[PDB]
Design a protein around this ligand. Structure first.
Ligand SMILES: NS(=O)(=O)c1cc(C(=O)O)c(NCc2ccco2)cc1Cl
Ligand SMILES: [Zn+2]
Ligand SMILES: [Zn+2]
Length: 256
């Protein structure tokens, strides 16, 4: 029954998922003065032109926009990655106030939200197999700050009213995730983990430097979602972020 409350929040996860205190947990704070430029990183390739969204789901901790990954449509390659990774879903983490909500931080700065585009390494054949490997996933993370609206986000925020509570889903076809990317693909990268249980240490993190801006009204509608299921007392879905974890031996590399 893990979650983000006082009794089931991130300081409790280790009891059911002892890897929470592992050697390569996420998220982390990105200290921009310790991260080193790595000229050996290859150019990053985000190929989302043929992405096919299917559905949007409130899963009790966030909402997933899910993609048909049965073929090689929307893929992420290059940068630190070896091979091809297929997009399977994206989701966000956000706070109750604009001063918090991201998972990664940048010189301890917290953004209002953070977008995660989750991809799995097609050499392992399916997602389930990929999450048994130290290079099975790649997550593209993008910070959200509040300012001007992101037009590319409005189809997402407008469907949220139809998936208010845990377990609800809605059809969500033809959504183009290219509409959520910033201008620059400059990034930081490090090896890490899922930020939610089961916290598997299977992820190459690629965190973009440039945030996207969304409006106060768009993030306010994120905060109207519910953690609870239908007819249950209302628990607003806010602060669904894990705080920064110990970097341990790892090295954060910059692509710029
Ligand atoms: N927050 S996150 O981007 O680290 C993340 C978050 C989630 C999530 O479900 O919140 C998730 N679900 C799929 C899954 C199940 C086991 C391994 O990956 C995958 C990822 Cl990578
Ligand atoms: Zn959940
Ligand atoms: Zn996430």
């Amino acid at each position: 029954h893990w979650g983000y409350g006082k009794h089931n929040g991130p300081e409790h996860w280790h009891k059911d998922f002892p890897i929470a205190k592992g050697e390569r947990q996420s998220p982390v704070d990105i200290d921009t003065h310790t991260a080193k430029y790595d000229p050996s990183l290859k150019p990053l390739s985000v190929s989302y032109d043929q992405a096919t969204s299917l559905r949007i789901l409130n899963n009790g901790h966030a909402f997933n926009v899910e993609f048909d990954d049965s073929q090689d449509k929307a893929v992420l390659k290059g940068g630190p990655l070896d091979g091809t990774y297929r997009l399977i879903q994206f989701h966000f983490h956000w706070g109750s106030l604009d001063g918090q909500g991201s998972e990664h931080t940048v010189d301890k700065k917290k953004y209002a939200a953070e977008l995660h585009l989750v991809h799995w390494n097609t050499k392992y054949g399916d997602f389930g197999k990929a999450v048994q490997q130290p290079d099975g996933l790649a997550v593209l993370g993008i910070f959200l700050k509040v300012g001007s609206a992101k037009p590319g986000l409005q189809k997402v925020v407008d469907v949220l009213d139809s998936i208010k509570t845990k377990g609800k889903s809605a059809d969500f076809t033809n959504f183009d995730p290219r509409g959520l990317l910033p201008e620059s693909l400059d990034y930081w990268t490090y090896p890490g983990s899922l930020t939610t249980p089961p916290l598997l240490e299977c992820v190459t993190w690629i965190v973009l430097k440039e945030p996207i801006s969304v409006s106060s009204e768009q993030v306010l509608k994120f905060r109207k979602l519910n953690f609870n299921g239908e007819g249950e007392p209302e628990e607003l879905m806010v602060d669904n972020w894990r705080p920064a974890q110990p970097l341990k031996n790892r090295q954060i590399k910059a692509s710029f």
